[PDB]
Symmetry: C3
Subunit: 107 residues, 3 copies
């Protein structure tokens, strides 16, 4: 999928996560977040496909997206070890990270 679709999916699943009371739905949505990050691992924001592969702007985007995926994985492990509320705290921190990465290349 494209960058915008995946970022909106991440925000959607974050909305689904804060309204969760059991780790089942939590872990499900977190794995959907990791899924959306995996499908759009090479996607490019509409803001800057006309940039070179070794451009520091592009590398900024790439490492930020990797950061997203890594933070998702940490929250997934939290939701796997049983802790349904600590996973949601990590999910709100992830929401901060997702907000930043999206608002940087949203338009």
């Amino acid at each position: 999928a494209d960058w915008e679709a995946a970022m909106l999916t991440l925000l959607m699943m974050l909305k689904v996560i804060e309204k969760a009371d059991n780790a089942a739905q939590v872990l499900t949505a977190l794995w959907f977040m990791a899924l959306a990050a995996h499908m759009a691992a090479l996607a490019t924001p509409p803001k800057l496909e006309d940039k070179s592969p070794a451009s520091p702007e592009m590398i900024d985007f790439r490492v930020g997206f990797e950061e997203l995926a890594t933070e998702i994985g940490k929250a997934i492990k939290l939701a796997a070890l049983g802790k349904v509320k600590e996973a949601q705290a990590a999910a709100e921190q992830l929401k901060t990270t997702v907000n930043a990465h999206w608002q940087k290349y949203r338009s």
Copy 2:
């Protein structure tokens, strides 16, 4: 997974999509479709594993499967921008494409 399992998953999720009233279940099933296409990206239909890698039949199969994945991504973006019904219209068009690709190598 194998080609047949993934194509039946696509048809199943298409059946789940037309009975949807909110973008949440829609986007969920569409991402499951993209997932099934990602897991079976190198799968071969039972009809023609005894073909060469550069055989135009095989390349036909490959580009058709890529077409499936791309059309799924477009429907996913539609279901991400909020439009739950335009996503279902794109999903019925995708159902046409999925029907063709499956009935070409079903047996």
Copy 3:
């Protein structure tokens, strides 16, 4: 994701599978299992990251994880051809395999 998170996800989805009466939830959880195996395809158990890439211990781990993924795919095809209960029988056999692979490198 990491090995432990993915293995706990597999066990969780196995728990969700045995309580299933329709192939919809079955196939959904099985595809989540294949998803978790795909995300952690290169993950390393906490027990043995300090091993060489060509170490037979590491290769044992790798082929066992591939075995997990393959058995998941077989169960997914069973759950796709309509057979909701034969898929659950294959899922309990998969539970045996998952138990072994997890208890080998759990700590």
